[model samples]
Target: SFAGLKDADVAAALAACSAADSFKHKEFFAKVGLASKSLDDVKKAFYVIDQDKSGFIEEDELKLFLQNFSPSARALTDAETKAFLADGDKDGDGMIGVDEFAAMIKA
Candidate 1:
């Protein structure tokens, strides 16, 4: 599904994140931006990654999505995954919505 995107480049983009499996594209896009220029594709990818349409791409979705991001990126260890969801709960209610995600992208 990650056609046309280089695995190494995706890995490189993920270098700053301590936990790549839980990394959000918008967060990365919000920060240094993409090495590739296709924003539309990236957005579409995110929409697809949000499997449940719950507006929150939780650990499972994020984990599967990371495989598509970079082969070199390791799977999220259970603790890392748990911690990510915990940290991702910005409002501390154990959920992350699109509004919250958008705010993160904008930040």
Candidate 2:
């Protein structure tokens, strides 16, 4: 369970993503309003998407990352998930932590 962000925020962001045809990081940031959100808010968004409450987004969670944004969204392909992780998994940790997620957002 995550805190900070309301269900409406998540739902609205998810709806925005659901309506889009493809997911691009920068575009997604704008769609989800992450571009304007503070670091704290971004962290909250990360927690909401983390799903397993594991503090990091593992490969399995990343595979279904799109679904975290929307139930009807398609799962990421394995290659896609790898690319996603590669972008955010700084320090070569093979997982995306809150700090890494924030950095990815800021980048």
Candidate 3:
């Protein structure tokens, strides 16, 4: 809880787990330690990576996302970026989508 926030609806959160469109929201929810992720998993995480929430992440989201950790995510080591992209781009469209986003944090 970086900002000391709390989710009032575990029921809603549980429902979110089953909804693919909202699954990607985990990158946001993860910040609250709402599910299986450890605090370290969501540290410094933010929603700037998914502005449209169109069930997939845009190139801008990806590009800007990388900049957070470095001047550019391209600067990330292959293994690191690969893993991150794999998790974010759940739809395999070389981008991140809603279902993929939701799936990333199902735990």
Candidate 4:
């Protein structure tokens, strides 16, 4: 359906999508017309936001994530953050494990 893209161009797009690791990654993938991104994309997005690299996303890290995910987007209000976590934080651990975060995405 398009002829403007070369092999290298496709590879670059795949690589970018494969490497994405931010809350905005899905938006980027959709805009690029990717049908699906790799699991690496999910892991990378989670690990990047995991802050302390502890394999979990904590409240403070989550708060900072909301603050920094976009410049124009206002940081999440406290109740909003709480509700977000409540919806996604499986196991009642007060943190989002990588699997839980992925579930939040794919669910």
- Give the top-scoring candidate (lDDT): 2
Predicted candidate 2 versus true structure: per-residue lDDT over 1-107, tens digit per residue: 23344556666666654533444566666656676778878888788788889999888987787677567777777666777877888889899999988888885
lDDT of 3 by residue, 1-107 (tens): 33234444433443443432333444435543445554444322334346565545566565454344324223324444455577667556787655555456567
Using TM-score as the measure, what is the rank order of every candidate, best first? 2, 4, 1, 3
* Number of colliding residue pairs in model 4: 1
Model 4's TM-score against the true structure: 0.60
Could you give candidate 1's per-residue lDDT for residues 1-107 as a string of tens digits? 44345545555657756554455445555433432435465455556657788777777775564555655656666665565556556877555555554444443
lDDT of 3: 0.47
* Cα error, candidate 3, residue 93 (Å): 0.9
Better of 1 and 2 by TM-score: 2
What local lDDT does model 4 show for residue 18? 43
Residue 98: error of model 2 in Å?
A: 0.3
Clashing residue pairs found in predicted model 1: none
C-alpha positional error of residue 88 in candidate 3 after TM-score superposition, expressed in Å: 4.0
Off-target runs (Cα >4 Å) in candidate 3 are: 1-48, 52-55, 66-78
* lDDT of each candidate versus the true structure: 0.56, 0.72, 0.47, 0.58
Give all candidate RMSDs, comma-separated.
5.0, 3.6, 11.9, 9.5
Misplaced by over 4 Å in model 2 are 1-22
Q: How does candidate 3 fare on TM-score? A: 0.39
